[PDB]
Design a protein around this ligand. Sequence first.
Ligand SMILES: Nc1ncnc2c1ncn2[C@@H]1O[C@H](COP(=O)(O)OP(=O)(O)NP(=O)(O)O)[C@@H](O)[C@H]1O
Ligand SMILES: Nc1ncnc2c1ncn2[C@@H]1O[C@H](COP(=O)(O)OP(=O)(O)NP(=O)(O)O)[C@@H](O)[C@H]1O
Ligand SMILES: CC(C)(CO)[C@@H](O)C(=O)NCCC(=O)O
Ligand SMILES: CC(C)(CO)[C@@H](O)C(=O)NCCC(=O)O
Ligand SMILES: [Mg+2]
Ligand SMILES: [Mg+2]
Lengths: 359, 359
Amino acid sequence: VPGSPWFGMDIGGTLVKLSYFEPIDITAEEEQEEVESLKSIRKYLTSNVAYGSTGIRDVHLELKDLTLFGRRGNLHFIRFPTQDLPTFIQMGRDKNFSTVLCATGGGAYKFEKDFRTIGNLHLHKLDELDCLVKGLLYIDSVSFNGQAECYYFANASEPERCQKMPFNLDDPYPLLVVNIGSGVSILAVHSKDNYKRVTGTSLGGGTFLGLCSLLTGCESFEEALEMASKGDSTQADKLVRDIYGGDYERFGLPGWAVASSFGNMIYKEKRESVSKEDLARATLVTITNNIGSVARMCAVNEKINRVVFVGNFLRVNTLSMKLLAYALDYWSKGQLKALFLEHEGYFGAVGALLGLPNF
Amino acid sequence: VPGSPWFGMDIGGTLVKLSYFEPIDITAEEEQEEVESLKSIRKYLTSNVAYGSTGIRDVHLELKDLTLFGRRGNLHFIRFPTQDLPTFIQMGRDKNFSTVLCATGGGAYKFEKDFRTIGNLHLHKLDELDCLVKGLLYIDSVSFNGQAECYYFANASEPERCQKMPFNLDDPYPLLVVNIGSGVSILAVHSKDNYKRVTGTSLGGGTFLGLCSLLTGCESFEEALEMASKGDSTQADKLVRDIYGGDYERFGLPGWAVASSFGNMIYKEKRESVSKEDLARATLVTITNNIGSVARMCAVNEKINRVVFVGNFLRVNTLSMKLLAYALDYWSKGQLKALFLEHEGYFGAVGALLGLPNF
Ligand SMILES: Nc1ncnc2c1ncn2[C@@H]1O[C@H](COP(=O)(O)OP(=O)(O)NP(=O)(O)O)[C@@H](O)[C@H]1O
Ligand SMILES: Nc1ncnc2c1ncn2[C@@H]1O[C@H](COP(=O)(O)OP(=O)(O)NP(=O)(O)O)[C@@H](O)[C@H]1O
Ligand SMILES: CC(C)(CO)[C@@H](O)C(=O)NCCC(=O)O
Ligand SMILES: CC(C)(CO)[C@@H](O)C(=O)NCCC(=O)O
Ligand SMILES: [Mg+2]
Ligand SMILES: [Mg+2]
């Protein structure tokens, strides 16, 4: 492995994710041979938790004293909007920084020519879903600083008992991976080298954020979630009891289940009384439950009972995680389990970093 | 079979559908024994095509010279909004109308006590999905006045050739039935008496109409479709080429495919330039393609290759039908076929009418 900072980057449709390995076993002689630009990069990344106006280091996710490529170091996790990649690349071309970059996600292709404006930088494009699988399996194998990387919600159908609990993935196959980013990819993983994309859905995190922005005027993902936490989705949705006056008993649909998402918004007087918060929550519930349903159908067809949900639609989004856990547990009568991972949307970036020794 | 007009009624979450059998073999003696109220009902229904301000007789769907319950007559098809059922029931209690009513849909239960305000009326509640199956199989078996009730889109992947063609369902089993009403029910039909509800989705016609109303201010389903016919959904959706700069080749996703529905609406400048017509079309495309995807997954898991789509989401909605035909044909490489039926959303009402001899 190369004199070069060790990065892996996943350039998605909405967010760039960057994994950075900071060596902590640097010898006295190594510090001598280190050029100023390399020292400047290391100090900038490790002494700041906000980069410019939109970059964020997720300090709580840092893996400390990881051994990687024969060196000990800390693995850092950084995100910024893809819209701001021109600023990243303009920073990279700065004279104070004159690298082998393993990059994945669609932007590895879309912005290939832009990365090559950085003199002599060597860009290696790696497949988006292969990096996801490799990074997910790697992070679970090294643990989250000794704690479990994977968790589930115990007793997900009872709120008085529902609680996050660690889950052991030491024999993780087979596994359904549901990656909720701008859109959704669903993978059936049979071994480390044997997986297929079962299907996907374009109703993903970008549908939640785009519809929420149109309907409520929210200006950020976090604001959308804050609104949804205060709302009542039943003010927008038409429920089974709104159609039947009760349960649809013959087919086991309870009266409180949604029959038609946003279905009460066909009435003008209801549109005039619904709140922005109600609409935010209805958008979240609609998108989340649709993903849960698709995930359930894929698990049944693939004969897989463990479904891991990743991607940044679920970052700081406990409501959606609990909705997913409840829906899988309820519809399957306990035979399917929703699983979640602490490192959220960073697995592609880690998987890309792991491709470095091949170059 | 009873002195009573022969009706079947399906009271849905949004629309009431009514089938009415008009006898055309009435003898001279039968006209004598007919009371004025029965004559008044027959004349009102057959001499008007609009009933009050919101009732419509779909004259083009009339089955002429049908033999039913040993009598020859014409089968009529009438719809009105469930919101106006109080007007129907108040009309029914009029003194000029002083019946065995077979009723299905959720409103058969929700409005049971209201129907019983009509003196001595006998209400028989029948199951919503059983009536759908029985009515669908019946109408296809009697034909559409000698023409095929069922049709498909030939060469659905090529617009220069794509065209509606009759399809023979003379041995209709097995069959996947996708009923797109306010919400969506999906049935696997193995015989006339053996079917199961495979799943459903709450993202149905009410989601299209509710979201469209919120986003565009449209005041009717027809206005929503008119707007969507003029729009460009790619102004709201984020496409694969917006993320990759091209195809995602490894997994066969073409650049023109939607990656994130409404995903370009996360950007304020794009929200400010998108048109209402664009938003209407994006809503239609998003809802329709999600149903097509769920239908495809259910067909693969049930090992069924014929998928019939019914329900009034598809009435006067050729765009959605063609989207469904293309999506099933494309994803399945021709192994799945989307089928459509001329009688749209009336099968439950017909199935209810067919239950009359049991009472
Ligand atoms: N700070 C944020 N800004 C924007 N979106 C966020 C943010 N935090 C969470 N999200 C959500 O995270 C989603 C993006 O998840 P992510 O896994 O990073 O997708 P992506 O890789 O950029 N897209 P894709 O090309 O489809 O894989 C958005 O659609 C939002 O729902
Ligand atoms: N004139 C109309 N008025 C309202 N909706 C219409 C109209 N025409 C077509 N639609 C569409 O038809 C859908 C209703 O279809 P329909 O099959 O009659 O459902 P329903 O039986 O009333 N609902 P459900 O209880 O879920 O079965 C609406 O959601 C619209 O998308
Ligand atoms: C980046 C992609 C395109 C691939 O992971 C992602 O946005 C996705 O899977 N969208 C859904 C595409 C679909 O299956 O309809
Ligand atoms: C009238 C019902 C409830 C049943 O046909 C219909 O609206 C439906 O199937 N809605 C979808 C319910 C679901 O499967 O989530
Ligand atoms: Mg991604
Ligand atoms: Mg219905």
